[PDB]
Structures are given as C-alpha cells and as structure tokens.
C-alpha cells in the first residue's frame, strides 16, 4: 500500500479537526490561558535517519533505534540539517507532472523519539498525539504497533495512542515522506522543504469530553447590544446528569455567563443532537475587536456534572466583531474597512519552514510598526500560535486553505476534477474547523494559483454555510469567479488595463464597474517588492482613498525566503534558487520581501509605511487639517510635531496634541512662522509621535509624517569677483587648467575630463563620462534569462539596441578662455552598429573661484528603447567617510518611489548610501539633490546620485552580494535623470509612462567646487 | 435521477450529511451519478438523495451540480423541503389544505406553501398519495389544486409497484410475502407494499 | 485493511465514471445504435459460494475454483436463491448504528467466472470490467492478483484488467460483502438484499 500515491487516502485513523485544546482540570487555569498538566511538548531531541526511499527503511527500525541514526532538534525541516537539499521552484513542480504518482526516490526521514508516559494518564482518559506540522506525508507506528497516517503539511494530524501506550518509556516511529500525492496540491512559490516541522504535543483529554466548539457573536443595529452563542459537542458518556457552562469574563471580571444540559433543539424528523448543547449569552455594550483596538475578552468552556464537578474546561480569546459585506462594501462593525495588507509566508533564514514564537512577534511589531493592519496566509494554514498573536495585538487575518496546484496545464486541471474533491475538501475543512474562533481570521481564502475548478465552487458553498460570518474569497480562474465574494486579483494595475484571454486584469477602478459588477474589491497581491522595487506604490494608495470599493490589498510579500549558507571561512551568507544545487531552481524568486530574512527592512518598507498613514494632512496658509482614517478610535496617543527650516537649517518647531475623532478632522493654527530673507526654500515637516509606549510600538515612535514647499526666496546675489583668472595650456592632447591650487585636465582624444589636482592630489581613477545605463534590477530583468531571453524586458531591450555597449565618438573639443574663465566645449556621439543612440553636448566653464560649471544637453533617438538614466559617472581616488547631501533622503529613494523622502540634510557613513540586496543591482540613488558633498568636493545642481564602492559594471556582472567587493576608490553616478523603477509586478515592463525617459532632448546642470 | 444516499436511521436525521468526513463518500454518490446519465434527455431534474436531513454536505453538492450542469434544476427534500439545497419545493406527503405543523420541517399546506413570505419557488411533491392497500383517498383534492394553482406543477404517486416477494406453500404454491416472512427481524411488515400495481404488475 | 469500515476508502483501482460506452469501431453502427464487439456481456451462469464473514473465505479460492460452490446465474441478488434472508426494515438501520463498523458476521457472496478473450485484446488495447451494480461493496481479483475494490451498490465500478489478462482461460474472483460503510448511505425503504 502506496497511500502516498492515492489522492483518495489522505489519512488512516485520524481523529477529527478542532479548535485548539488544552483539557484544563482547573476552570480558573483555563481563564487565564495557563498551562495544562493535560497537554505536553514532545518538542526536543528526537533520533533521525534520512533514507532515499520508503523501500529502503529496515523492519528493525520499527521496534528499535538505528545505531546509524542523529540525534537533532524537532520540530525542523531535514534539509536544514544538511541531510539532503531544499530546492528553490516557482511554477513548475519539482516532482515530474504525473498525478498521482510521485517518484521513486523519495527522501525519507525516519524520526523517532523514546518519551515518557506517567501512568496517571493511562489509568483514565484519552491519550491523543499532535503533530501540528508534518510535510508531505507520514506513517506513524508507537511501541513498534502502526498507528494510522496524514497528509495535508499545514494543518495537525492527531491520532489515539490510549491502547498503545504504556507506564513510563515508550517509542514513537515516525516515517515522513517528502513526496506524496498531497505534493500535487502544494506547488506554493517557496523552498520546497519536508520533515516534522511544527510543534508535537501529547493531549489528555476525560472519556466523557468537549469534542467541538464553536462561538459566534450577533450584534444590533448599532452594535450597543450583542448575543454570544456557543454551540458545543461532546464525545464520550452522554448522561443528564451533564451540563455545559460558558462563562465570558474581561480580564478579572465575569460578564455573563449560561448553563444547560446537552441537547439541541429538534431539527429534523428523526430529533436533534443529544450531544450537542447552545449557550446564548447576552453581553451589553461590548468592547467591540478591531486591528486598531484589539479589544478581548474570554469565554471559558466547563463541561461539568449538575451537581458540579468540572469534567474538564476548553476556552478561547473572543473578539466581538462582525465582518459583512453590504452594498458592495467590506464592513467590520459596521465601518468600511482599508487593508494596509502584506502577504507573510512562514519562513527563518536558518530554520526554514520552522516558526518561532520570537520571529513570530518580530514580525508583527515590525508590521504594525509600519502601518500594517492586516495579513495574509499565503498560501496555507499557520502555525497556531499565529492567530493566537494576531488576535491579541490586532491584525486582520485571511486564513488561507493549503490547495496550490499551479503547476498543472491548464491551472484548473485538477481542481475541477471531481476525484481531487475529497483531498481538497479536508484542506478547506479542516482550516475551518481549526481556526473558525480566532476573531483575527476575517475572510477565507480557497488556497491560490488552482485555476477555477468545479470544486472550488462546491467547497465556496460549504464554507457559507457552516459559516456565516465571514466572506470566502478566491483568486483563481479570474479573480471574480463565482466563488469569491470580493473581487480578488493579483497584480492588476491601478489604470492599466492588461487584457489577458479568459484571465485579464483589469485596471482596478474600471474593474469595480464592470457590467453587473457590485462587489468590494482588495487585491490579494500587488506591489511585488523584489529587489530595488516599490515603485508606483503610492498610485495604488490614492486610488484605494479615492473609491469607495478599493479597499486596499496585501503586498507581496514580507520577508524575502534567502536561506544561510557559510563559505570557505565559515562566513554566513543569504543563498537563493540553485545555491544548493537545486535544479531547475528559479534563482531569486524567492526573495520579494520588504525586509531581508534576518527583518532588516529593505528601503521600500518605508514607502509602504508612509502611504499606509493613518492621518491625511492638508495645508490652507499656516492651518494644517489633519484628518483621521481610523474607524473606531479616536487619537488618544498622539502628538503633532511640526517644524520649519530653511533648506536644511531648522528655523522653528513645536508641539500641538492631536485629538481627532475616527473618520474626524482637526484644524491646527501655526503659530506666527519664520519669516527670513535669506535666500532658499522654507519647510514645514509634521511627524505624528506617540508619546506612550503600548504592546507594539516604544514610547515616541512616529507613525506618520508629510512636507510642504513654504515660501520660497530665490537667490538673486551676485558672487563676490574673484581675484584671479585660470590659465590654459594646449598640447595636441590635452587642454590643461590651472588655478591656484587647482588643475583640470581634458583629454582632446577622447574629450572627457580625465584628472582634476586639489594641491596636488590627483582626484579621480577614471575620467568623468556619459551614462545612459543602470546595473539591471530584477524588474528590468523579469524572467529574462541567458538560455531563455524576454525580449520584451528593459534589459534586454537595452541590450539589443546597444546600450551597454555603445561606444563615444567625439564629435568636438574645444577650449576658449574668457574674461574670467576658462570654456571647454565638447560633443560626443554613442552609437551602436551604424545607429546614433544618443547625443551628449556640453561646456564646462571654470572661473576664477575655482568653480567648475558643467551644462549637459542630451539628445536620445526616439526609436531607441527609453534609456535608464541620463548623467554623469566617474571613479573617484578619494575614500571617506561620510556623505552629506541636501535633498531627499535619508534613504534610498527613485523617481516612482520616493514619496516617504523628506527633502532635508542629511549625513550618514558611506555604508549607508549603499543597499545590499542579495541580487546586486543599482541601489542607493538619493533624488531631488540640491547640494552633494564628499570628502573636498562639493557637487551643486538639481540631481538625482547614489556613491558607493562599487560600479555599475561590478553589480551588474555579480550575482550575490557576498561577492562583491570594495574597488579603489569610490564610485559616484550623478544623474540628470533616472527611469522608474516599477514593481507592479517583477515578470512584465511596470515602469509607468510617466517615469520613462522619454523626452527625446535633456538637459542638467552641475557645479563642481571644493572646500 | 437521484442520488443513492439515504440515511434516514440516523439521529438526527443529518449526522452523516452535516459532517465533514462523509463529503466524500457522498460527493461520489452525486459526481459519478451525473458522470454517468448528464447527457440523456430524458432526466429533467437532478436529486441529493432522500430522507437524510439537511448537512453542508447537501449545500456543497448541489453547487457542484449547478456548476457542472446548469441545464437542470437541482431537487433535494430534506430537512424540510425548502432548503437552501433545492431549486424546487419539494415535499413528502404535504396535503392540499390542511397544515402539519411539525417542529423544525414543518409540512404545510402545499397552496399555502408557496406563498409564505418571500418564497418563489414552484412546487412538486417528490411524492405523495400514499398507496398503501386500500387507498388513494382525497387524489381528486390533489389534482383539482395542481390545475389551479400556476405554481403547483404535480408530484409522484409513492409508489409504483408492491415490494412483496414470491414465497412457495408446501404445496409448491406461491403466495406473497412481506416484512418477517423470512425470518427477518425487527421487520416492518407490510409497509414494503405501496404500490398502485401488485408485485406481478396487475393493477390495484 | 478492512477498507469496507472506512468512508475514506470508497474505491481502490477504479477507473472514472462517464456517460455509457460501446467503443464502435464502425461508424454506422454506432449511429444505428448495433452491438458492439468491443462491448461483450459476461451475464449468465457464475460460479459462487456463501461465507459468514470474508474472514471465513479461503485463499484457495483466489486461484481455484471452489467444489462446494454452486452454478448460478448472475446478475442476481444471492436472498433470491436462498443463500441467507432478504430483510425488510423502513427506517431502523438492518444494522447496528456504529458508523463506520458492521457486523463481524457478514454475509460473504464469492462469486468466479472462468472466460477466455480475443487473441486481438492481448495484443493491444485496454481491456476493463464493468460491474453495473454490486451491493454493497467488493474486492475484485483476476488470475488470481488483486485488481481494485469498490463502494456504491448503484452505480457501475470498472476497473483495467489489461494487465492482468492471460492467453487461454482467465479466471475473475469477486468477492462482495453484505454490509460496508457505504450501507449507512443506504437506508431507504425497501428490501435490503
Ligand atoms: O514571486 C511571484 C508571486 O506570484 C504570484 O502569482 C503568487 O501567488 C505568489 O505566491 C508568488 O509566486
Ligand atoms: O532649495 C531647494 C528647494 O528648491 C525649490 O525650488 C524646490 O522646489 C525644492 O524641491 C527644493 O529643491
Ligand atoms: O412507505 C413510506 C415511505 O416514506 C417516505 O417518507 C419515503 O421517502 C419512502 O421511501 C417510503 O419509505
Ligand atoms: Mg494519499
Ligand atoms: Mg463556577
Ligand atoms: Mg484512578
Ligand atoms: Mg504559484
Ligand atoms: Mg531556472
Ligand atoms: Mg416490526
Ligand atoms: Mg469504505
Ligand atoms: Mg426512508
Ligand atoms: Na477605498
Ligand atoms: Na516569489
Ligand atoms: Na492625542
Ligand atoms: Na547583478
Ligand atoms: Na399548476
Ligand atoms: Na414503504
């Protein structure tokens, strides 16, 4: 028997699905959710013994320990510990397409572990194994007895050890195996891994016991007024003399509380449930849940004889909320919701698929940090202690059944085959059964990347009716089939329309009205931030505030899945698709996250938190309106701090309490400002702080902030003349400059500016030239690839049109010297196999004050491919320490994605203007620079830059960023101007029109001076 | 055309069918049904069954078939005849005018069934006119109601043909049998015979 | 494996269900509606045998047939030939209500049919077996080797026995069991056979 190889077993022996259990035999332990006697952590050191197929495991293993095998940590994932090696796969299986069979060589691994059983739990009772994790599928033997199996790797399997085990030591043999025909409906786009990788426990429960419960909270109109009903089962000795007791406290407080024996109302012709009772509680004024006021409270499960002894006690956090949608809105307690989403996959650099309560907290400080409010369980159900987190700190929750068959031709192939039905149901039912009291979890999802198959629409159907305060949605076939009740999609624009067939996106505002449309629509993915991305992130936020029914979305994604892996020295570093020999792999793929795997946030996290404010500011004058988007609080931990400064020099600031009602506005009267003379542009900057501390954020952290232009006073001074004049001396080769202290030198051959002299320091290590390109970021890039080329990607348009190799041809060098200055002139042309590409004019005027004038006017071609950038690069000799710019910052910001940039000064160490994405790209470009200063030189203009310790041709020519490496020097590319970077998805051009080179003629302007 | 799922011994009557671990056991029973007989003409109507309450299972299967095959309506009587599970009320042994108000399915009056507050939908007895022995009493109330009323569209007779089998005296003369002629125990006797035609097709 | 107490289990080895089949191999016919001799009916005389419980069914019958079986015809329901009782029960379960178990003793029918195909179906081609109605449940094996199992008395279960054909006399060995998880799906009003 082959189950693994048969979708029609999914398990032998399993016991039914529940909510979490503890079988507390003290109701005051359940209230305050302490620890149970009754429910034990196998968790630890287990023995392992990895196998390269189910047929070559010996019979002896069964009943004894293999001398052979390792002792290692559980719960893990097997190719963590290096026994064989994950392998990185998009869409295409990892396994040869051949339902339902998987292959032969099949990595097995036998764990076993030798625990102790207290006799006390044999004497009485039920005693039941957990196995919250367990991937692909596994067969489970205890004191050398089989004991039953499961499939499904993200939901517990649960199996009835009571007439196996025995007093003291026993031994539980469990055989895992990677591949099975659960395999076909797990193609999520992560690391393939396997092995017992969540938490294993032993559970106590009475003969006679709670076996199911379920609550539901019904409001009134006006929310002042709720109904809890709990509907609980029992199994085991069904007698009147039992009785169920819920009681719902907040904190130390009892609110209501019900009692009545077992017995439902009649139902049909043959009766009721004998072994089912409903308590109703009638709770006033509630405290209602929401991610912005986590507000809970706890009912406690008694099941107990009449006369009262506490058989045992089940309980949970409840959240009195309602979901509904109405009139094609998505409400929560009756409010119109916005989700500031982001899809989560399970995932530790150095664990895997293996979730820890530390990483897991880390992650949801740094979301709500960052103004995130809700998340998605992409692509399966999580570890439990998942809900338990969100429900508690507040997080909005799609719980998300593990059904991904992407892989298959066409998509939908097995999911409307009715002989998956059964394999597929358990995946949705189960998550149900599981999770269905978590107010956390708001909607279900169907799984992802199935297609729309006749089964989805059957499993839509149950889910709405055994549970009806949630809405099902489903991404598939479409992202508006008839089994999602919100209009879905993944990565559809916010006014580009792309028409696939059968499966077009839709720009989301014309989506919403479709003919016959009416639903809310939040996309399930968007913005997909892999690598240097983000860009139009903001287009999607207006559009989302400005119609009703876009309700926001989840970013994909939030960690990138980079794994660790040590070098020669033992060094760590981050490894992608194919580091581990994995073939095929799909190379970086894998790392689309706002933050690095070890939650350093990448650039974009910044973006993402200041488009998903919570406060909306307008400025009339010096009145500032600041306007709240929270639904039910109002802003009892906030201040307003505001402050104005003159291009960088703070002028004056203060302090204002902010008390804005939800959905409310405040208008705030700045004080009499600062009114100077002096040349430059006024500022004023609002940062909203909160001053206390609370669970997820320290006292003063800021949580939104916005910059207006104030007045402006152009400069219209005359400098000082100077006391002096530069002198030019011509060589055939060379037109040479001198001032002072101060030496340039253009070369006549090639017409750049080859060596600059400050005393008598030679300053640059490569002549200052033209450049039209960028180090590719994986956007520009797509799923282009040497043996595969999309010709369609910028990258490779570039390169087809001769970007990257387009050589200078000078067209003219000339040297004038003038009353005060010296003027070089040059032109070059770039061209490529007979083709002019772009045309680069230019003077360079040097004054007596040893300022160098640089005035460029470029032409591009306009049937060449929109270039990546228009500016300037050079190596420069120095190294130092700091850059201090006037402009955007402090971190990396692009044209399309720079919204969250204040325009200030900044300074940070050079390592600072450098972002290390595991697949090296262009980084680190500061726009809307005013003013760059390095070391002696100073750059003035109106510029975009990024400086660093390695170029362009480094970057792009280097696939990791571990092995990159310092060059002499440092690297400075000033830019006129720079493309987009896009990000609305990573496979197709995202760059919007608007951020495209297009123009046809440019021009910029730079001074080059010291101090 | 109907399902073969019947679990009318169970208490309550939906144990199996609201239970998620029989979805698929049932799922078969319908998806393989409509495999099988989706493309004859003569079948107008699916069913889920009979007599086995009203589960989620019921709500899932007959999306199933709305999807698969929107060309027939889906029936189904269970848990009341008028369930969320049925594109036609669908009664058993509902009387023209006079109420049955059972607890939780209740069986009205099959005029005033059609009428209450928001319902739509036409209505067919699965069956009706019990024709056990001596019987059929009141089938001109039925017709005369059906021709009436827009709404009511008919029902079928329960039933067809006498389940009563041959059995051989000591003379090797047969006579017919019912419920614990054959040893056959508990046994509920001559309820297996309902029909308008004896076993051996002669009319009743 | 008792895969008849699991609800889980409701089929090993059958192929797909779908609308009725005759593989023509001549246009014409198939539009007249003629038989097919793609399409051969094995109906008539079986060999069979009664047991208490498939525990009591031995090995031996898997490769040979059984002396003290009888010649009968098939199809057939095995109360009518007087094997054991048909009992009539309206609503009660004929069983104890202990989802998804059945009784230790129940009535084994083991049926076997030696026959013979045409040389053309072991040379190529796909060869399968429909069993239009078998109630309630049954184990198949053909030369002796298991081939499937199957669940719902109502609808037919076909299964590949391509594999398993031989040249010369082939031999099906079917065991059918009374009762199966698949009875609590089946308690309508009528003889339970
Ligand atoms: O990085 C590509 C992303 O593509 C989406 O289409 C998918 O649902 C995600 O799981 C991820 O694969
Ligand atoms: O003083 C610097 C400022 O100059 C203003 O003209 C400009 O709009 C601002 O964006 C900033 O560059
Ligand atoms: O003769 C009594 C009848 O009762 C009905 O309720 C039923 O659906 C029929 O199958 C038959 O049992
Ligand atoms: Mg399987
Ligand atoms: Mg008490
Ligand atoms: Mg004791
Ligand atoms: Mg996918
Ligand atoms: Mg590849
Ligand atoms: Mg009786
Ligand atoms: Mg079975
Ligand atoms: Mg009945
Ligand atoms: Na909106
Ligand atoms: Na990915
Ligand atoms: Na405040
Ligand atoms: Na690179
Ligand atoms: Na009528
Ligand atoms: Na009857």
Redesign the pocket.
Known sequence: RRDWENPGVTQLNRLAAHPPFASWRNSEEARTDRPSQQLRSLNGEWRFAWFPAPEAVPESWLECDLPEADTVVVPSNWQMHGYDAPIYT?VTYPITVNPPFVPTENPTGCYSLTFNVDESWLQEGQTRIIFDGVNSAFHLWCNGRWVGYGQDSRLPSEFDLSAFLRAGENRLAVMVLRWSDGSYLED??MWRMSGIFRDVSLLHKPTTQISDFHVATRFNDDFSRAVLEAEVQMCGELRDYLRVTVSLWQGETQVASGTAPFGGEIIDERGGYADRVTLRLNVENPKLWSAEIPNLYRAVVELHTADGTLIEAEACDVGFREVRIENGLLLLNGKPLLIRGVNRHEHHPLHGQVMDEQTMVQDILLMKQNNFNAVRC??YPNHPLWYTLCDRYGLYVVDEANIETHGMVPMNRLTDDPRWLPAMSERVTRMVQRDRNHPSVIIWSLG??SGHGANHDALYRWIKSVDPSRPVQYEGGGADTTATDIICP?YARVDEDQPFPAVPKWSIKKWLSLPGETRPLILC?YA?AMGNSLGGFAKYWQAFRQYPRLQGGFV?DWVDQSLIKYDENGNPWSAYGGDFGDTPNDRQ?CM?GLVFADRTPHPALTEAKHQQQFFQFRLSGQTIEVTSEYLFRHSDNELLHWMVALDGKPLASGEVPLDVAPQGKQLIELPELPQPESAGQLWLTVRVVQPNATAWSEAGHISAWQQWRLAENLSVTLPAASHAIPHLTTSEMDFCIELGNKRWQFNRQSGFLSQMWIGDKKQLLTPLRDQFTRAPLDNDIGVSEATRIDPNAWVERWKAAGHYQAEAALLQCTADTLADAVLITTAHAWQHQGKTLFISRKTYRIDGSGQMAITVDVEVASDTPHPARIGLNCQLAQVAERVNWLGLGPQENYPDRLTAACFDRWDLPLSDMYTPYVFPSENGLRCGTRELNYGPHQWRGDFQFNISRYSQQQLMETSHRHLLHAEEGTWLNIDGFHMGIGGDDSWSPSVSAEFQLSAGRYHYQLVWCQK
Do not use: G
């Open positions: 998009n999520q786009d992409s692509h992802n990347e993944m993915e997909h994909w793929f689309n």
